[PDB]
Each structure stands twice: as C-alpha cells, then as structure tokens.
Design a protein around this ligand. Structure first.
Ligand SMILES: Cc1nc2ccccc2c(-c2ccc3c(c2)CCCO3)c1[C@H](OC(C)(C)C)C(=O)O
Ligand SMILES: Cc1nc2ccccc2c(-c2ccc3c(c2)CCCO3)c1[C@H](OC(C)(C)C)C(=O)O
Lengths: 145, 145
C-alpha cells in the first residue's frame, strides 16, 4: 500500500568504510555503494544517479542531518525530489547479514556489497512469492499504467 | 521486438576521463558512470551492480577485447551473464550531445553525466510516447508476467 515514489536512504559502517544504502520502501528493492567518505557530496551524487533511474519523489532517512548540506539540497532541487517526514524494515541488518555470508568470497568490501545486493534483490519472497527486483518493476510499471 | 535481458556496454572518452555507458537495447534506457580507469576491474564491478538491479542475461559491446579479462569473466560467471555476439543506436553521440548541453551547469564531468542520464531516461519519445525509463520498467514487468 506504500507510495511507489518513496525511498529510504542511510549510511552503515563496516570495516572502517561507508556503505550508502537506498531502499525502495514499497518493494524492499535495494541499491548500495561503498563510498569513500560519509559526505554531502557523496549523498548528492548518489541521489542524482538514483533519480535518473527510478521515479524518485520523496526520500526519508533515519539521520535527518544527512540532508542538510547545500550540496544535497541542490541535488533534490534539480531532480525534483522532496524530503519525506511522515513514514508509518530493517535491511541494514539483513543486508549486513548477507554481506557477512558472502564476505570471504570477494577480496574487497565493495565487491561483497554488490554481491549481497544482487542476492537480496533476486530472492523469491514466499515464506505467489516474487523477489524485490520483480516487485519494484511491477509496482512502478503498474503506477505508469 | 528485442529480448529484454540484452544490454550493450561501452566506454567513451571526454575531458581525458572515461565514461562507462550501459544501454538496455529493447528500451533505450541508459546507466552510466565516470570511471577512473578504463580497466577490467572497473567493468567487472559495473557489471555486478547492473546485474543486481536488472535481469541481465547477455551483454554486447563494440570493443570485444573489453570482455577478455579474467576479472570481467569472473563477474559474468558469478552473475550468470553470457556474452551476446549476434546483434541485428547510437547513444554515445546522443548522450554526448546532452552532456554538452548541460556541461556548464555542473562543476564536474561525473555530475554532468548523471544529469544527462536523467534527462535521457525521462524524455517522452513521441516524434503514445513513453520515456526510456518507463519502457524499461514495462518491458521487464511484462516479461515477468
Ligand atoms: C579484486 C578482484 N580481483 C579479481 C582477480 C581475478 C578474478 C576475479 C577478481 C575479482 C572478482 C571479480 C568478480 C567477482 C568476484 C571477484 C566475486 C564474485 C562476484 O564476481 C575481484 C573483485 O573486485 C572487482 C570486482 C572490483 C574486480 C573482488 O573484490 O574480489
Ligand atoms: C561539486 C559540487 N559542488 C556544489 C556546491 C554547492 C552546491 C551544489 C554543488 C554541486 C551540485 C550538486 C547537485 C547538483 C548540481 C551541482 C548540478 C545540477 C544537479 O544537481 C556540485 C556537483 O558535484 C556533486 C554532485 C558531486 C556534489 C558538481 O559537479 O557541480
């Protein structure tokens, strides 16, 4: 029943590095990237990429100060994004769980993260039974037509 | 009439930097990234991200030697991707055109690229009349069901 334009964006920390995690709330679909620094510039750039791919209307975060930089506000201004305050989970544990499971199968954390994203988005969820990757595409397509 | 799992991947050069460009052939939808070096490791990593997001079955390129590294072959092995040889355009000019149009509106090339990707994917194509972003989502969703 969730609006299809709503996304959640946070950062977690692992191995002294920073993982930016975006969740499409309606579907559970995720996108993630290991970023060199937890900064406004990184968040702004990430939001521009996200918005060119999906119809992003509002973004929520669990750390509001993430969104106070002028650099982030410029990215939401240009892409027509607004901040979402009133949201009614949680993938940071679950994605961290998958990362832990595949970690030794890759040299770098960034590679393991993308493996974990792949696994998460492709998993059939019947425990009828689509994956997050299938649900996002259906939700958006139905919302077009 | 194109298969929905087929993607084209190339690199272009601008301002002495490297832009990796992936095109979903059936829709015209694009994803791009400025990469620090034109290397197998960058291509492999990019393919892992791409494959966690879309149902990527085959990838074609205009420079076959792009795909000879062990690092790329490991990424297509792990993600279940095969190379596509027999393909029946062109965005590298068109995307370059949009980049040129917005270039002065951003400090960095990487930012301009993402602006150009956004513009390209959102543009209604009626010259009925959906955008590449709408077409990819419809094509994939219909292919699920
Ligand atoms: C550094 C590195 N070196 C290699 C040398 C030879 C062969 C493969 C690799 C891989 C690799 C590539 C795809 C892949 C996996 C690992 C693990 C399974 C999924 O696919 C990596 C990975 O890094 C890059 C992806 C950036 C190249 C890694 O971090 O381990
Ligand atoms: C370096 C940089 N510094 C800034 C300082 C203050 C305010 C904004 C910026 C922007 C910016 C952010 C979003 C955006 C656009 C530009 C241009 C329109 C689309 O949205 C950038 C851009 O770089 C980052 C996105 C990495 C921060 C840029 O290359 O110009």
């Amino acid at each position: 029943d969730c609006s299809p334009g709503i996304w959640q964006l946070d950062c977690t920390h692992l191995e002294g590095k920073v993982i930016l995690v975006a969740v499409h709330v309606a579907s559970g679909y995720i996108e993630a990237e290991v970023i060199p620094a937890e900064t406004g510039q990184e968040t702004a750039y990430f939001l521009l990429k996200l918005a060119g791919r999906w119809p992003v209307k509002t973004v929520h975060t669990d750390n509001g100060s993430n969104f106070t930089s002028t650099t982030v506000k410029a990215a939401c201004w240009w892409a027509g994004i607004k901040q979402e305050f009133g949201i009614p989970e949680s993938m940071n544990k679950e994605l961290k769980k998958i990362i832990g499971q595949v970690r030794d199968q890759a040299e770098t954390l960034k590679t393991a993260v993308q493996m974990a994203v792949f696994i998460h988005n492709k998993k059939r969820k019947g425990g009828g039974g689509y994956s997050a990757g299938e649900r996002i595409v259906d939700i958006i397509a139905t919302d077009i037509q």
